[model samples]
Target: SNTQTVLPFTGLNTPNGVAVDSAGTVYVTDHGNNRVVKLAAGSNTQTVLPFTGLNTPSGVAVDSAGTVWVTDHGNNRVVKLAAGSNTQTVLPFTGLNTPNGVAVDSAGTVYVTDHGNNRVVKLAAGSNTQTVLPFTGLNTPSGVAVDSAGTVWVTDHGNNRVVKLAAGSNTQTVLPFTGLNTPNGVAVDSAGTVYVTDHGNNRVVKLAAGSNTQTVLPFTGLNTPSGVAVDSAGTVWVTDHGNNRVVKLAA
Candidate 1:
């Protein structure tokens, strides 16, 4: 007997990433459409953000201030869209190769997975440049998320594993779990529980707080789920890529 609800949001085109802001506004990177579509907390219809000429957008995130951050993958850059700005400004990260994952904490510190470069980079709050972390040998780091404790979670897509970088440290602690086939999108909740979309496995997995075991959510037959985000109230949102929609599940 489970009470968790599985809600699918439709009308998206090749949605590769999804993010829910502090106010419960849902944003999706409609990759095929080359646009960012958003739904306010209580809005019935989704509206397209005024980001024009985007090329193969991959990841999207929103901070507490309603500012949007998206990784323009085809442009090889990350862009920031402030609450009142229609235009997005490209971040000053140089030598970026397929920056597919972007996450901004409540303090506005941004993290990105330079997917093709096999490295993770960070932009300190109010900084123009990025700091390349020394955590090395990441195999196609596809998803990035930072929790309240400054713990950065990433899914190593090529390695079939998930790792975390703690605050004030550069070392990555690999989560001890097996059967993660090409983990893609990652999100951590307020209690430090981590959720990852196992793309190759066609399922979403959850690693509970202080638990060494991983449990797969009961959403059956997910076709290549990609992006994952956990809202303040503990709802888990995921972009079901193959399904061309986003799904929200109760915690």
Candidate 2:
């Protein structure tokens, strides 16, 4: 069963990504609008944050330190924004080919999907250095997420599947799962259950840990849903891109 709650709209146009901080604040990337918006824990009012250097931001993630990381897709770089401040810093890096997805592991290591390059790059914590994970079998990869166990999950958008790469290893496995249609954003819950936004199918599906089976969630009203995030409370938030809105579902 699913209960959908429509969040207040504050100029959300072509919203692409969604993330929730530990304090229950929700942040969204207003892609077409060229900005980011925040929704406080207990308020409907939305706050549009100010920052420098953003171009078609696609994916968003909040780190443990309350900092926000955004994939400046069109800019070919990633931007790090400090919590409670509008100033931003573009991470010093190169060779990003149309980066699309962004995520931060528990150790502060940042991971981004180079969509055009067909690989994911990891940025060392507090450093501008980067290392592209030695991966194969990727095709226009998009959304990315690091699980609690430190493994990386990527949406192989062009291939119509999702792949997992073990931490510190070059091996990549295309899960034995099926029934995915242009999977985009991905997230993992505390229990390790994987959730994927099936953008083409207009729904989100769950893959239980250690299994190839998929159970489609009750999200039936989505329209081109893109990024997805699981909050600390286990609630699932989705960016309904085609409809220009965000939808929240209780855990």
Candidate 3:
């Protein structure tokens, strides 16, 4: 839209997850810095969350009430911060184990991946009640996402695979990796296409929803890719672990 090219604004440390709101404000989970930093509207700048002294903050998502949900990986719990307040709540008190990724459904249910425990758990959005899904066949599930259809997709770090669980169905499909390697994070677009970050292979892969086929963006510059997200503009943003940077690609 301009004769001058716009360069990516930088200044983050081991940024892991990002979510852009309707007004274009960007919220990023700075893992290395151990806090959530908000790129305030119109500033192209930053504001760190007031909740300090946390242990490895990883994932973040704004709720309907404008509150933010964050996953404290080292604490083995998920915490919520009220909008314009510094107070927080640690949820599902006793079920999570080294939780890595989290996503909230339209119905308010929260899904978290217990990476170390090798399971995915569901927590009532308004309460602390939780139900852990079967982990018998799971192998280090790291990242998770829920689509409009209510289906859950998780990346298995140990098994090096991607899995899908239908809404209210116990049946699971361990999608054969056409080119996945040590999958770390996953995201499902509005159209249902699944995008995953593969750490071992150092790339990002897209799985066409219905056919189980894929197209990899193996961006050669990435050293170790971790988390993934997509904006309304169809731009795919990924965190490059090894390079300590974030990259955006045309989806």
Candidate 4:
């Protein structure tokens, strides 16, 4: 049940995150360019969020309605680009610090990785009030995702582990796996299989929903895999930061 596809030219600079929408559109956060680029299902890629002073955008996520959310690292904020608008701004930046990664659930709630703050932030899609989940003992958390069940999973880069938070509660780390090396990006498949980029180890790792079992990727070919994404077709796409290429693996 595993296969691979490699995208040769992603035209990315320090590509840090990826997201695919219901229509199969691919979105990538080009941090070095300070913008988010979008590639239609079968069209050439284009800049959806232009440089326009983005300030080190580190992650991108699209909602069901086609609205895109981006994490602004330099500004310490999470921003929303309305369905078809080109303007963007910090959403509920009350306590954000070096926001790094982001993901949106089926219900439109936005969860962001507060890198400098070492926590995950939840912002109501249409409101400004925020719910801060500063799970104790966390260190330099980066990428994050929300599952169908609403549970949250975050990559703790400084701690070299992945931590899970319960659906309705934010005070505890339900599952924490150590032994990783500077884990960064993360993605969850339809079946809840979790995938994370082990940056320091130069590979990607997957963990089944209810078990601690892991399956490492491209056992011998990857170089500094830094971001991970799963499309609807069950294809796994990973960004090789050191190799400067995007690779795809079939599920």
Give the whole-model CA lDDT for all candidates, comma-separated: 0.84, 0.85, 0.75, 0.78
Model 1 scores a TM of: 0.94
Backbone clashes in candidate 4 total 2
Per-residue lDDT over 13-125 for candidate 4, one digit per residue giving the tens place of the 0 to 100 score: 77778888778677777777677877766565564554356887888888888788888888877778876565665687577888889999877888988889887878876
Identify the leading candidate in terms of TM-score.
2
Q: How accurate is candidate 3 locally (lDDT)?
A: 0.75
- Write candidate 1's Cα lDDT for 1-251 as tens digits: 12344343546777888898777888999888888998877567778898867898999988777788899988889988878866677778889898889998778888999999999999887787789876667888999988888888889899988888888887879997679888889998888888999998998888887799988887765898999888888788888888887777775
- TM-scores for all candidates: the values are 0.94, 0.95, 0.89, 0.90
Clashes of 2: 0
- Pairing residues by index, what is the TM-score of model 3? 0.89
lDDT tens string, model 2, 1-251? 36788888677899999998888889999999878888988797898777566888899888888888889999999988887765688887688978988999878889999998998899887786888887687888989999888888998988989888876777888865587788889988877778888899998888888887888778767898998998767788899998899988887
TM-score of 2: 0.95
Backbone Cα, N, C clashes tallied per candidate = 0, 0, 0, 2
Better of 2 and 4 by lDDT: 2
TM-score of 4: 0.90
What's the ranking of the predictions by TM-score, best on top?
Answer: 2, 1, 4, 3
lDDT of 3 by residue, 1-251 (tens): 11211114366677676666656566777788788877654575567878656677777777666777888888888888887666887775476677888888767788888887888998887775788865457787888888888888898888888888877888887765676778888988888888888888888888776765688763667766788877667667777766666666654
Candidate 2 accuracy as lDDT: 0.85
